[PDB]
Amino acid sequence: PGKKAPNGEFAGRKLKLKRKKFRWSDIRYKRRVLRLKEKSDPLEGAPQARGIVLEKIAVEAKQPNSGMRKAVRVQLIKNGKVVTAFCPGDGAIKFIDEHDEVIIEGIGGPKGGSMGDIPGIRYKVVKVNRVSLKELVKGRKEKPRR
Amino acid sequence: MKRRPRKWKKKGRMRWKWIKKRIRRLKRQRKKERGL
Amino acid sequence: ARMHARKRGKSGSKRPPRTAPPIWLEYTVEDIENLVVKLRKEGYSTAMIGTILRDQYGIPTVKLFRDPDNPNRKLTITRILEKHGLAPEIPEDLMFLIKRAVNLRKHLEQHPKDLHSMRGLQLIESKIRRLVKYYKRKGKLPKDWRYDPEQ
RNA sequence: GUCGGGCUCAUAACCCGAA
RNA sequence: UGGAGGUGAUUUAAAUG
RNA sequence: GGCGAAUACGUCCCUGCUCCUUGCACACACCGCCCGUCACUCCACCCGAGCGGGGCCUAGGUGAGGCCCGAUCUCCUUCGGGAGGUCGGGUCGAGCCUAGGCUCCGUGAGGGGGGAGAAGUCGUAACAAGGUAGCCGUAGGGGAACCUACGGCUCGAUCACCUCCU
RNA sequence: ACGGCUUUUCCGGAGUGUAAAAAGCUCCGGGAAUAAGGGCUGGGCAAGGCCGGUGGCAGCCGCCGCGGUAAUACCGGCGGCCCGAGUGGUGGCCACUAUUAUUGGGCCUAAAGCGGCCGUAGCCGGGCCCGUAAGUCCCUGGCGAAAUCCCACGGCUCAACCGUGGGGCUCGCUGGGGAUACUGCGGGCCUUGGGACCGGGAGAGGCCGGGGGUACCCCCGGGGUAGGGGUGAAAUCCUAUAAUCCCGGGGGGACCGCCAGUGGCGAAGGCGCCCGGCUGGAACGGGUCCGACGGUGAGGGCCGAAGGCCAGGGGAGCGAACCGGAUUAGAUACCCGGGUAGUCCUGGCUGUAAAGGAUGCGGGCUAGGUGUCGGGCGAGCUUCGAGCUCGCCCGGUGCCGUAGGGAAGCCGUUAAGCCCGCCGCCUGGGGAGUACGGCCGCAAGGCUGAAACUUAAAGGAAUUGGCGGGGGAGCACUACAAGGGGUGGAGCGUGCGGU
RNA sequence: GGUGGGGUAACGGCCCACCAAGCCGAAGAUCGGUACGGGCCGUGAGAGCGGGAGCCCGGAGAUGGACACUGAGACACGGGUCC
Ligand SMILES: [Mg+2]
Ligand SMILES: [Mg+2]
Ligand SMILES: [Mg+2]
Ligand SMILES: [Mg+2]
Ligand SMILES: [Mg+2]
Ligand SMILES: [Mg+2]
Ligand SMILES: [Mg+2]
Ligand SMILES: [Mg+2]
Ligand SMILES: [Mg+2]
Ligand SMILES: [Mg+2]
Ligand SMILES: [Mg+2]
Ligand SMILES: [Mg+2]
Ligand SMILES: [Mg+2]
Ligand SMILES: [Mg+2]
Ligand SMILES: [Mg+2]
Ligand SMILES: [Mg+2]
Ligand SMILES: [Mg+2]
Ligand SMILES: [Mg+2]
Ligand SMILES: [Mg+2]
Ligand SMILES: [Mg+2]
Ligand SMILES: [Mg+2]
Ligand SMILES: [Mg+2]
Ligand SMILES: [Mg+2]
Ligand SMILES: [Mg+2]
Ligand SMILES: [Mg+2]
Ligand SMILES: [Mg+2]
Ligand SMILES: [Mg+2]
Ligand SMILES: [Mg+2]
Ligand SMILES: [Mg+2]
Ligand SMILES: [Mg+2]
Ligand SMILES: [Mg+2]
Ligand SMILES: [Mg+2]
Ligand SMILES: [Mg+2]
Ligand SMILES: [Mg+2]
Ligand SMILES: [Mg+2]
Ligand SMILES: [Mg+2]
Ligand SMILES: [Mg+2]
Ligand SMILES: [Mg+2]
Ligand SMILES: [Mg+2]
Ligand SMILES: [Mg+2]
Ligand SMILES: [Mg+2]
């Protein structure tokens, strides 16, 4: 490869076109300008969402860890799509019941996705029947209507 | 097909020549059904 | 480097820097013009005339004398021939290339499978078209002049 | 084919005896 | 001292964790 | 303690160990590493008979309403004319109907590979000359990794000989 | 714990404030009274090697990683750290990032130079003289609202905020004056780059016609008689219709040994028997000619190994598919005996390779040493040869190596070094060179080419070991070879498994 | 685009009659996607990259699609007509 080109004083148009052409090779730029994330996001760009619990499940941790992680299947109010959400805390799965409404938010992993030894789960429960789950797991507050 | 010489390396994969043959066999079936 | 083969040959002439004709050269300008006209009438190219003048008459190039008419310029063989009306109608290098292309084309009519020689014809015709672009730019060829082998 | 013994770090292959 | 090429050859069977 | 021999004075063929050099995708260190089909569980996707529905351009029929020019009628006039009804003609026009072509969302019998899981299964293709050196292009064949033919590359081990260098 | 003090804030009042109220502000009485949380505590990263629970379960974890009964990492107690009326969680943009590179990145081995070349637009373009004044530089007129930004001073207790002045911002437009170095434009003059031409030479460069070389296969005739062929070992196969082997003749298709050389020629793919004809390119020698006619090259065009396809020929040898004999647990193979397409010629299509120097092309510059091919020059030999030896210049082709470069392997005037250009390509690993759409092809196929989703590495150069159905050297009766005596079969002593 | 008119507050293919074949485009037309424009705002050593609700200036709209009366000014958010 010779000297980087074009360098000429009157070659502005070609230099600008070169930079524009190879910028589409950057996956960050391409996803933002084409709005690809918006096209497939079940939360539709929101930082939090509300849904209704359909069942409780358990997911195995990935190798070489061992254990069962407790989660719920949630149907979102805004569009009816179903997603899996983690329930953080010791004994937290005992405060959840079927037909209850929950508030979920991102689980906080790399690239705005999953984390840790549980790939496949992208969300976590924050509130249950409009009460903070962290309080319930610690105490300091009671889950209403039995 | 386009050239990907990295695919020819053998560590942890089967031989690319035969992968290519399998892909071409699969593409023939799709083209036949597309004609009916 | 060479225009197509990319070789870097260096052979050529090494002219010393000088202004006046040497002391040992006795010919005047009129004798030199007469010699040039006589040689051209014998049927030689402009390059051949200078070769003969150097080799046989001991005349290093005619570009050592001032033009007797125009003091702004020195003498050349083509200028001398123009002064008498015997200058070529087509520039000589273009003419020699066209002549080479005509001979090669009739060879290819009898040898259609000689592909290596055909690339030579393609390179020659590229040279011819470069020269015609230059000469039309300078006005030495008419604007309607065109190169066509079928001519 | 069944059962037992060899060979091998061990299994398969292989060798031997028997009903 | 150290290197680059060419032509010939290669005496049964022998899987696995 | 008593009695008391045979054979060899060698070799690395078998079983193994030490050292130099060389190849290595191994370091849990060859009892290493590792590939594909079929079977099971889960996720996302592609092709798709049928199946409901929406939006655009056309071509034809219809058309609330607006404007202009006419004839006549009713009621008022300050005698200038001014409100409005009925009919004729011209012209403009949202909407509506039919047909034609593309476009989009929703379900969809059946078909196809992709990714995880952990092992149900058959073999051992690649890594050492990996036990037939490996690999590229093209073509045919095979449960599966793969095999074979022509041309090419070294990103191939070992011994002998030859050539070309420093 | 004692002794004392204060009242921002708090409680109750008067005045001022206000359209009226409320806040605010000035005073008076009471009294330390009325006022601290959130996150974290294994590394990054400030802070515990303490105690009690749990025991690959529960749980933690942005990333790396913890937890398998003696947890500084999970839950809790006590301690400690950071920030503080705040402190944590989730999503987005900038920075981090020279992971978009004008300033300022990469492409031999890691992602990445089109298989090769010709050329259109564009970009980049050799020296001197004269003119112009478009680009460009300087001066000055008319403009680019206010708010927003920076500075000093002033008004609210200071500040935030607000006012008076100075500057900046909308980097853009326009009326005039001046300069001429560079770029652009017009005219003149050159020979250095490039091209043309002439001379004596070099070369498996290409096409066409003719003449040969051995070898091999088949057929006819003579001799001779029981085997030949082939493997690790065998068998199928050939042979008394006389083989293998030897001799005398006839026919056929492909291919050109030794000499042969990090030798030669060509853009690359590729090119090697001899003689004759046609034809392409290059080097050297050159006080010959033309006079910047140049570089690169989006689109576009031509060439392009093997294999494959379409028509017509040809078929010795070899040999996909296939048919038999073996090997093996199996053996759709490796080995052996046969064998269709194909390999060859003529006219077309296809456009693909580890098409690799895995290194795009042109120009200038930056120690040496030593081989070899072509041309030229000088000197000395000579059997007078188009012969031999030594030295120097130019152009090709190898090796060692200085400065410099690089992650290193290594490259190093045949650069992967310093500088002036133009074009092509790359932006973590997979999904995938796939799906969909288009163009091309008779067909096989070619060119162009995403997304959902998945994942913490993948990839490169070098180090120490271990291993190899790799090489070399050495050694041992728990190795062999040469030997002597046995154990394994019976009954019993004793130890082990199982029951 | 031209010639001759109409209409308008006014120039104009703004609309007609007649005569020509022009006009735009790989320096990206046409078509598709997204979006009110600017002063400014966030960030960065700077070169840059991203945004443009709130205040000021300009534009547009009054459930969707059409169309009129009065008036200096409207085809009128708290005025009129049809679907
Ligand atoms: Mg066994
Ligand atoms: Mg390892
Ligand atoms: Mg093994
Ligand atoms: Mg193997
Ligand atoms: Mg084997
Ligand atoms: Mg092998
Ligand atoms: Mg086969
Ligand atoms: Mg610390
Ligand atoms: Mg966290
Ligand atoms: Mg403990
Ligand atoms: Mg704790
Ligand atoms: Mg980089
Ligand atoms: Mg690469
Ligand atoms: Mg290349
Ligand atoms: Mg070119
Ligand atoms: Mg110049
Ligand atoms: Mg100026
Ligand atoms: Mg301003
Ligand atoms: Mg004050
Ligand atoms: Mg102040
Ligand atoms: Mg102010
Ligand atoms: Mg006979
Ligand atoms: Mg091109
Ligand atoms: Mg045969
Ligand atoms: Mg090659
Ligand atoms: Mg090579
Ligand atoms: Mg390449
Ligand atoms: Mg020489
Ligand atoms: Mg050469
Ligand atoms: Mg050289
Ligand atoms: Mg070197
Ligand atoms: Mg990538
Ligand atoms: Mg297609
Ligand atoms: Mg023993
Ligand atoms: Mg023995
Ligand atoms: Mg016994
Ligand atoms: Mg008019
Ligand atoms: Mg909008
Ligand atoms: Mg905008
Ligand atoms: Mg608002
Ligand atoms: Mg409303």
From Swiss-Prot, chain A:
The gene is rps12. The keyword RNA-binding applies. One of its GO terms (molecular function) is rRNA binding. GO terms for biological process: translation. SUPFAM superfamilies: Nucleic acid-binding proteins. This is Small ribosomal subunit protein uS12. Pfam families: Ribosom_S12_S23. The keyword Ribosomal protein applies. With S4 and S5 plays an important role in translational accuracy. Located at the interface of the 30S and 50S subunits. HAMAP family: Ribosomal_uS12_A (MF_00403_A).
Swiss-Prot record, chain B:
Belongs to the eukaryotic ribosomal protein eS32 family. GO terms for cellular component: ribonucleoprotein complex; ribosome. Initially thought to be part of the large ribosomal subunit. Crystal structures show eS32/eL41 to be a small ribosomal subunit forming a bridge at the interface of the 2 subunits. This is Small ribosomal subunit protein eS32. It comes from the Archaea. Keywords: Ribonucleoprotein, Ribosomal protein. Part of the small ribosomal subunit.
UniProtKB/Swiss-Prot annotation, chain C:
The keyword Ribonucleoprotein applies. Gene3D superfamilies: 4.10.860.130, S15/NS1, RNA-binding (1.10.287.10). The keyword Endoplasmic reticulum does not apply. SMART domains: Ribosomal_S13_N (SM01386), Ribosomal_S15 (SM01387). It comes from the Archaea. Keywords: Ribonucleoprotein, Ribosomal protein. PROSITE patterns: RIBOSOMAL_S15. Residues 1-17 have a biased composition (Basic residues). One of its GO terms (biological process) is translation. InterPro entries: Ribosomal_uS15, Ribosomal_uS15_arc_euk, Ribosomal_uS15_N, uS15_NS1_RNA-bd_sf. GO terms for molecular function: small ribosomal subunit rRNA binding; structural constituent of ribosome. Residues 1-20 are annotated as: Disordered. GO terms for cellular component: cytosolic small ribosomal subunit. Part of the 30S ribosomal subunit. Belongs to the universal ribosomal protein uS15 family. This is Small ribosomal subunit protein uS15. It comes from Pyrococcus abyssi (strain GE5 / Orsay). The lineage of its organism: Archaea, Methanobacteriati, Methanobacteriota, Thermococci, Thermococcales.
